[PDB]
Design an enzyme around this catalytic site. Sequence first.
Site, PDB file in Angstrom:
ATOM      1  N   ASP A  15       0.795  -1.249   0.000  1.00 48.84           N
ATOM      2  CA  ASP A  15       0.000   0.000   0.000  1.00 48.84           C
ATOM      3  C   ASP A  15       0.826   1.298   0.000  1.00 48.84           C
ATOM      4  OD1 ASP A  15       0.768   0.140   2.696  1.00 48.84           O
ATOM      5  OD2 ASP A  15      -1.173  -0.514   3.485  1.00 48.84           O
ATOM      6  N   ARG A  29       0.955   6.784   0.184  1.00 44.55           N
ATOM      7  CA  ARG A  29       0.228   5.783   0.926  1.00 44.55           C
ATOM      8  C   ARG A  29      -1.175   5.728   0.328  1.00 44.55           C
ATOM      9  NH1 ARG A  29      -2.689   2.507   3.165  1.00 44.55           N
ATOM     10  NH2 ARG A  29      -2.541   1.776   5.312  1.00 44.55           N
ATOM     11  N   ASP A  34      -5.675  -1.125   3.661  1.00 45.71           N
ATOM     12  CA  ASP A  34      -4.599  -1.590   4.514  1.00 45.71           C
ATOM     13  C   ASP A  34      -4.193  -2.923   3.984  1.00 45.71           C
ATOM     14  OD1 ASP A  34      -2.770  -1.339   6.561  1.00 45.71           O
ATOM     15  OD2 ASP A  34      -4.115  -2.436   7.949  1.00 45.71           O
ATOM     16  N   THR A  35      -2.976  -2.994   3.474  1.00 47.71           N
ATOM     17  CA  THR A  35      -2.339  -4.232   3.104  1.00 47.71           C
ATOM     18  C   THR A  35      -1.542  -4.787   4.304  1.00 47.71           C
ATOM     19  OG1 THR A  35      -0.428  -3.030   2.102  1.00 47.71           O
ATOM     20  CG2 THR A  35      -2.254  -3.778   0.589  1.00 47.71           C
ATOM     21  N   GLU A  37       1.616  -6.036   6.323  1.00 46.20           N
ATOM     22  CA  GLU A  37       3.056  -5.738   6.244  1.00 46.20           C
ATOM     23  C   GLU A  37       3.723  -6.933   5.572  1.00 46.20           C
ATOM     24  OE1 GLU A  37       4.092  -2.723   7.156  1.00 46.20           O
ATOM     25  OE2 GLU A  37       1.993  -2.169   7.618  1.00 46.20           O
ATOM     26  N   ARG A  75       3.786  11.283   3.959  1.00 45.17           N
ATOM     27  CA  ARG A  75       3.399  10.473   2.798  1.00 45.17           C
ATOM     28  C   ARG A  75       2.232  11.082   2.125  1.00 45.17           C
ATOM     29  NH1 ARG A  75       2.725   4.597   5.570  1.00 45.17           N
ATOM     30  NH2 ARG A  75       1.059   5.815   6.503  1.00 45.17           N
TER      31      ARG A  75
HETATM   32  C1  LIG Z   1      -4.106   5.604   5.134  1.00 43.62           C
HETATM   33  C2  LIG Z   1      -3.810   6.617   6.154  1.00 43.62           C
HETATM   34  C3  LIG Z   1      -2.929   6.340   7.198  1.00 43.62           C
HETATM   35  N1  LIG Z   1      -2.638   7.271   8.073  1.00 43.62           N
HETATM   36  C4  LIG Z   1      -1.781   7.001   9.214  1.00 43.62           C
HETATM   37  C5  LIG Z   1      -2.601   6.406  10.359  1.00 43.62           C
HETATM   38  C6  LIG Z   1      -1.687   5.422  11.024  1.00 43.62           C
HETATM   39  O1  LIG Z   1      -0.988   6.109  12.093  1.00 43.62           O
HETATM   40  P1  LIG Z   1      -0.122   5.203  13.081  1.00 43.62           P
HETATM   41  O2  LIG Z   1       1.214   4.994  12.393  1.00 43.62           O
HETATM   42  O3  LIG Z   1      -0.002   6.102  14.250  1.00 43.62           O
HETATM   43  O4  LIG Z   1      -0.812   3.957  13.308  1.00 43.62           O
HETATM   44  C7  LIG Z   1      -0.718   5.032   9.890  1.00 43.62           C
HETATM   45  C8  LIG Z   1      -1.056   3.714   9.248  1.00 43.62           C
HETATM   46  O5  LIG Z   1      -0.275   3.605   8.058  1.00 43.62           O
HETATM   47  P2  LIG Z   1       0.362   2.213   7.712  1.00 43.62           P
HETATM   48  O6  LIG Z   1      -0.724   1.232   7.539  1.00 43.62           O
HETATM   49  O7  LIG Z   1       1.141   2.457   6.449  1.00 43.62           O
HETATM   50  O8  LIG Z   1       1.244   1.795   8.839  1.00 43.62           O
HETATM   51  O9  LIG Z   1      -0.794   6.030   8.912  1.00 43.62           O
HETATM   52  C9  LIG Z   1      -3.291   8.547   7.975  1.00 43.62           C
HETATM   53  O10 LIG Z   1      -3.085   9.373   8.902  1.00 43.62           O
HETATM   54  N2  LIG Z   1      -4.185   8.841   7.025  1.00 43.62           N
HETATM   55  C10 LIG Z   1      -4.466   7.911   6.084  1.00 43.62           C
HETATM   56  O11 LIG Z   1      -5.291   8.168   5.218  1.00 43.62           O
HETATM   57 CA   LIG Z   2      -0.130  -1.493   5.912  1.00 35.77          CA
END
Ligand SMILES: Cc1cn([C@H]2C[C@H](OP(=O)(O)O)[C@@H](COP(=O)(O)O)O2)c(=O)[nH]c1=O
Ligand SMILES: [Ca+2]
EC number: 3.1.31.1
Length: 129
Positions: A15, A29, A34-35, A37, A75
């Site tokens: 993702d 991103r 959510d893919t 890891e 991102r």
């Molecule tokens: C997809 C997405 C993720 N995020 C943030 C929330 C999550 O914060 P936390 O890192 O505090 O959990 C994290 C999850 O991304 P990843 O799934 O890439 O880890 O990225 C956003 O803020 N907005 C979004 O639209």
């Molecule tokens: Ca992920």
Amino acid sequence: LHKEPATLIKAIDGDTVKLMYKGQPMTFRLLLVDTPEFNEKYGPEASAFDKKMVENAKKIEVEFDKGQRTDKYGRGLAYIYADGKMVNEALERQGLAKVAYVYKGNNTHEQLLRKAEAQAKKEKLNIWS
Ligand SMILES: Cc1cn([C@H]2C[C@H](OP(=O)(O)O)[C@@H](COP(=O)(O)O)O2)c(=O)[nH]c1=O
Ligand SMILES: [Ca+2]
């Protein structure tokens, strides 16, 4: 929403992808999904699927939603298209992601993605197997 050009710099995982956008390198991103890891079950298959899609594309496009365009990690947050096909939706349809991170104001394609996930679920694909 509007599509804007970009070019692949490199695949990262299911993702996230590195793209040049407005001439600058950025990690994107994918919105609303959510893919797993890489280290988790279906992680490698999700990474491979996103990779193939973006590496085989002649034309990558990014489509920001109406809300924030960068997350707290810097991102870019977008729907990403590979020769007009949405990567975010394709992952859902294949059972290689879950709809997630649905924040008010950046959820234009929520129901489109949920519809794909439902069909993946019905077909018991990958994550839903
Ligand atoms: C997809 C997405 C993720 N995020 C943030 C929330 C999550 O914060 P936390 O890192 O505090 O959990 C994290 C999850 O991304 P990843 O799934 O890439 O880890 O990225 C956003 O803020 N907005 C979004 O639209
Ligand atoms: Ca992920």
